[PDB]
Design a protein around this ligand. Structure first.
Ligand SMILES: [K+]
Ligand SMILES: [Mg+2]
Ligand SMILES: [Mg+2]
Ligand SMILES: [Mg+2]
Ligand SMILES: [Mg+2]
Ligand SMILES: [Mg+2]
Lengths: 97, 205, 181, 142, 51, 32, 152, 124
RNA sequence: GCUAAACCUAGCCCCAAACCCACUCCACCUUACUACCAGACAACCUUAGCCAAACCAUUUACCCAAAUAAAGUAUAGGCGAUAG
């Protein structure tokens, strides 16, 4: 029980597709390109995460002030609750002071 | 009418038959079979068209296609790639063995040129008249759509009108004279019904 | 007579009854209104005979002789009804210019959603109708929040629907790489 | 060898149940020792033209050869025949072929058993044939 | 406590496929011999008399 | 394979449509 | 007619006339013993006994003296695999009595003699099964399960 | 314990509820004093059944017919078939004026008609 | 060897992008889903509190329309907690 009786299908991986063979390219766009572009500008994803890093509380705060006016009513309500909970947890709970 | 589950699995039996319901009850949910998306225009295999089996138990054999299932891209050849099953089995009688055809995918069969009984690939083109036809890649020749019996089975060439069938002289006679009167107005003229009373205004809201 | 509710006695008990095709919409456009009006009851009396036979088939627990006969009549009835309505709709546009026979309007209900209100016919005008005035055709500002909630609910359904399709296409190329090529 | 995959190419779909059903869980040791008289084509009769879109032809062949049959039950115990001593068999084999089908071939169809045929070899074990079961109200009749 | 066995399959007929179907069963062999052959009585004696 | 064309800083001034409500107000003033 | 808007009537207004009707009735065999003149129909819910009286007289030229109608409830007890109730549609039953003393008896629409085909019928698939079953015989008990295919 | 997901019909409720709810049949009269119902003859829809004696058309159509393409009727098509021929004859003669459009068949208003087009005051 | 045990999809999550839906006929604010009669009834008004301050009583963060930086700075505050 809890363990399969048959081997899973083989995992064929193409190590030389377009995405893998060209991974890491242009990561030196600034140093080798007269600093016209920045390697963090190559990053794709949420507009509140491009070229930025932080903990969960900072990510929620940054997300709320950038795309908060575009979030759905239920999603925005959940984000506000998460910020309220994280504020109390980090600033009032823990082992170190 | 038609009541199909969202992930209904098409099979050899037609939908709605007694065996189909038992094979596919409304509550069962099986893994959907992956089907290569082929447009209806790009499909080039029809019923009654001889095709050659490329891969299977009997490869390189040519047989007539009796049925095609577009949902699973299936082609059935009569008497080819057939297994055996006992039909009409009862408690006392073992049964009678009959050859049952197995469906073949469109990639496992290849159309044969009418001039040369060899498998070949075809591409759609247009003739001078504009009628769309299928033309073989090698030694391009016209491959007409084979004649197949209609689903209902009625043959126009051997049809005798019944007592409740309108004749062709009466079903095609043109009696409509376009005018600016409705059916209700026109019928009261023929029936002769007279109504001097005038309809009163009614508020609509 | 009541004999018109049943088929010919010689046809009673037979397994199959030969019947022709159903009238098509183009074949019915060559007939006049008087001819279509007469043809309407020819098909109607035939339809009552088929409904009577079908019910007795279930009563006797036997299959209907020619079930396809009922489908042909139903198609004939719908096609004939389509032709008559189309002629009146075309004539209504020529004389009045209205694309709908029944009056109506676009009004917001009490729930804030746009609906097509079909007008009814009343003897008295609308400002004197006690029952009509109790109905509310305006939404108060407290409904605007629920309108957004319903809009966002539709967005999630559409977002899931669009995302699922792209998942199917990407997975379907794994087993059939020739599709991409 | 239970090679039912190839047996379908040698016998028809009607002949197959008669051959394999009774030997499903039994072992058969059959061999062809010697042939006494060459086979002769006794009767050839074809089907009516286009009965169902296909035309069938049947050829009757008479064979009289010695054969050896050894049948063992599911547990390997001897059940019928002797594996050592062959005996003559006189049987009329009827063949068939679907003439309309281009890929058809002549396959064994059935065996003609004449009414004057001698009784077959008796089996090794004994058998019992029970009489009719009688309910209490029913009375037996001799 | 409302769960019940999935005993719902019912008997059906295997003699004939569904009606009004273009596809029909393809038969490779006929059921029986078109004309029965009756070998002459005493043909076993003729086996010895090869001539 | 061949790598995609390098990302370059698109030359020329960027003038957004002033009639677009998604245009930030700081890209339509004299300072911009 | 059903599913249509009836024009409103006021005093002195024109006669209401319907040229094409969508009412379809079906004659049914009563489940209980009925008087000879009584005829039973199934009519749509929107149909009245006044409309049915003119429906039979106007279309089938059947003189009718009395029409009595009742609404039959369709059972909602059936449940599918999802424990959701399945509703049998409600229908209206109409009892029509003939006018001039005529008697109506529901005919036998499936006579046994007419069902039996006098002409010979030979289905290819059925003929295959019938012949083989007659040819094949049960195993001889004295043979004790030994196959009869072998002639030895 | 009441079923709120079943259709509410006249068979449910007390006596006052059951008698007030109907089945969809149109009313053909009104109730007067003393619970006496007065049926209005003009409110009862009268069936206009034509004479079917010697009628050629039959419920079914023989299969030996050409497969004509379907051409839906349009207002532009109907105008050309019906009104256009009359206008052309009058246009060539030279007696044409917008004041006489009522003579060609045009109806400026639907009032005073037995069968008004919009809103229609006749059944199907 | 019974009961069982195993499985790979259904679909979903987070982003990007782009501003979404609702008249086929009939019915639906009266007891919704009910063909068909004198109404006059009309909408708008600070959130609070939990919680933190180891009680609590002033007070205690809650996107308001540019990421970053100025800056947790100037300020505010039982000049406490904290806010900014
Ligand atoms: K406390
Ligand atoms: Mg902490
Ligand atoms: Mg009653
Ligand atoms: Mg409840
Ligand atoms: Mg506290
Ligand atoms: Mg306390």
């Amino acid at each position: 029980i809890g363990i399969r009786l048959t081997l899973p299908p083989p995992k064929v991986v193409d190590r030389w597709n377009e995405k893998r063979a060209m991974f890491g390219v242009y990561d030196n766009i600034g140093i080798l390109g007269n600093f016209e572009k920045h390697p963090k500008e190559l990053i794709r994803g949420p507009i509140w995460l491009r070229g930025w890093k932080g903990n969960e509380l900072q990510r929620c705060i940054r997300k709320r002030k950038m795309v908060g006016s575009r979030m759905f009513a239920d999603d925005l309500h959940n984000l506000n609750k998460r910020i309220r909970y994280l504020y109390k947890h980090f600033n009032r709970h823990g082992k170190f002071r | 009418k038609v009541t199909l589950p969202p992930h209904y699995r098409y099979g050899m039996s037609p939908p709605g038959s007694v065996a189909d319901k038992r094979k596919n009850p409304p509550w069962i949910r099986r893994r959907p079979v992956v089907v290569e998306p082929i447009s209806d225009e790009d499909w080039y295999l029809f019923c009654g068209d001889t095709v050659e089996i490329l891969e299977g138990k009997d490869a390189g054999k040519q047989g007539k296609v009796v049925q095609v299932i577009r949902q699973r891209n299936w082609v059935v050849v009569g008497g080819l790639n057939t297994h055996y099953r006992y039909i009409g089995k009862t408690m006392d009688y073992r049964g009678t063995m009959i050859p049952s055809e197995a469906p073949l995918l469109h990639r496992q069969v290849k159309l044969v040129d009418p001039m040369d009984r060899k498998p070949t690939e075809i591409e759609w083109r247009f003739t001078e008249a504009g009628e769309r036809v299928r033309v073989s890649t090698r030694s391009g020749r016209i491959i007409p759509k084979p004649e197949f019996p209609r689903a209902d089975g009625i043959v126009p060439e051997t049809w005798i009108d019944g007592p409740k069938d309108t004749s062709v002289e009466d079903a095609l006679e043109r009696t409509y004279v376009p005018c600016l009167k409705t059916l209700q107005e026109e019928v009261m003229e023929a029936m002769g019904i007279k109504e001097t009373r005038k309809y009163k205004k009614v508020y609509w809201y | 007579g009541l004999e018109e509710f049943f088929d010919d006695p010689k046809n009673w008990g037979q397994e199959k009854v030969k019947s022709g095709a159903a009238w098509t919409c183009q074949q019915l456009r060559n007939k006049s209104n008087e001819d279509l009006h007469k043809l309407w009851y020819v098909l109607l009396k035939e339809r009552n005979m088929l409904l009577t036979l079908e019910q007795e088939a279930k009563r006797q627990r036997l299959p209907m002789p020619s079930p396809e006969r009922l489908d042909k009549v139903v198609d004939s009835m719908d096609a004939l009804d389509k032709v008559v309505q189309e002629r009146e709709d075309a004539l209504r546009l020529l004389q009045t210019g209205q694309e709908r026979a029944r009056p109506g309007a676009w009004r917001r209900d009490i729930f804030g959603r746009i609906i097509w209100h079909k007008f009814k016919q009343w003897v008295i005008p609308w400002h004197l109708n006690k029952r009509y005035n109790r109905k509310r055709f305006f939404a108060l500002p407290y409904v605007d929040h629920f309108l957004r909630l319903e809009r966002e609910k539709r967005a999630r359904i559409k977002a899931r629907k669009e995302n699922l399709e792209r998942k199917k296409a990407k997975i379907l190329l794994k087993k059939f790489p020739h599709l991409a090529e | 060898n239970s090679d039912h995959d190839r047996l379908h190419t040698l016998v028809t779909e009607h002949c197959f149940p008669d051959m394999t059903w009774d030997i499903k869980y039994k072992t058969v040791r059959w061999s062809f020792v010697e042939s006494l008289e060459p086979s002769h084509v006794v009767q050839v009769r074809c089907s009516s033209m286009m009965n169902q879109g296909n035309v069938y032809g049947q050829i009757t062949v008479r064979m009289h050869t010695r054969q050896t049959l050894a049948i063992y039950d599911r547990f390997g115990r001897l059940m019928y025949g002797q594996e050592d001593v062959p005996k003559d068999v006189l049987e009329y084999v009827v063949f068939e072929k679907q003439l309309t089908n281009p890929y058809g071939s002549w396959r064994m169809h059935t065996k003609i058993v004449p009414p004057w045929a001698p009784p077959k070899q008796p089996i090794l074990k004994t058998v019992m044939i029970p009489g009719p079961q009688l309910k209490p109200e029913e009375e037996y009749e001799e | 406590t409302e769960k019940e066995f999935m005993q719902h399959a019912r008997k059906a007929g295997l003699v004939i496929p569904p009606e009004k179907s273009d596809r029909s069963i393809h038969l490779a062999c006929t059921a029986g011999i078109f004309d029965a052959y009756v070998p002459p009585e005493g043909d076993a004696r003729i086996s010895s008399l090869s001539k | 394979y061949r790598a995609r064309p390098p990302p370059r800083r698109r030359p020329g001034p960027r003038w957004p449509d002033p009639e677009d409500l998604l245009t930030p107000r700081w890209q339509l003033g004299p300072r911009y | 007619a059903r599913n249509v808007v009836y024009p409103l009537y006021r005093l002195g207004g024109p006669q209401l006339r319907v040229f094409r009707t969508n009412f379809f009735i079906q004659l049914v065999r009563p489940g209980v013993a009925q008087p000879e003149d009584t005829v039973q129909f199934r009519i749509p819910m929107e149909m009245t006994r006044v409309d049915l009286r003119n429906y039979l007289e106007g279309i089938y030229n059947v003189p009718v003296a009395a029409v009595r109608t009742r609404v039959q409830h369709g059972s909602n007890k059936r449940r599918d695999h999802r424990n959701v109730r399945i509703k049998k549609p409600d229908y209206k039953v109409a009892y029509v009595q003939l006018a001039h003393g005529q008697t109506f008896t529901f005919p036998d629409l499936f006579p046994e003699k007419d069902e039996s085909p006098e002409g010979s019928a030979a289905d290819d698939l059925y003929s295959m099964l019938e012949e083989e079953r007659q040819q094949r015989q049960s195993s001889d008990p004295r043979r004790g399960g030994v196959p009869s295919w072998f002639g030895l | 314990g009441a079923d709120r997901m079943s259709k509410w019909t006249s068979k449910r409720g007390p006596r006052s509820f059951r008698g007030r709810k109907g089945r969809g049949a149109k009313g053909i009269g009104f109730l007067t004093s003393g619970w006496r119902f007065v049926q209005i003859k003009e409110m009862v829809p009268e069936f206009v059944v034509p004479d079917l004696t010697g009628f050629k058309l039959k419920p079914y159509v023989s299969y030996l017919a050409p497969e004509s393409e379907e051409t839906p009727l349009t207002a532009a098509q109907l105008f050309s078939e019906a009104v256009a021929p009359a206008i052309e004859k009058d246009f060539k003669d030279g007696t044409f004026d917008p004041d006489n459009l009522e003579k060609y068949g045009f109806e400026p208003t639907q009032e005073g008609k037995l069968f008004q087009l919009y809103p229609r005051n006749f059944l199907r």
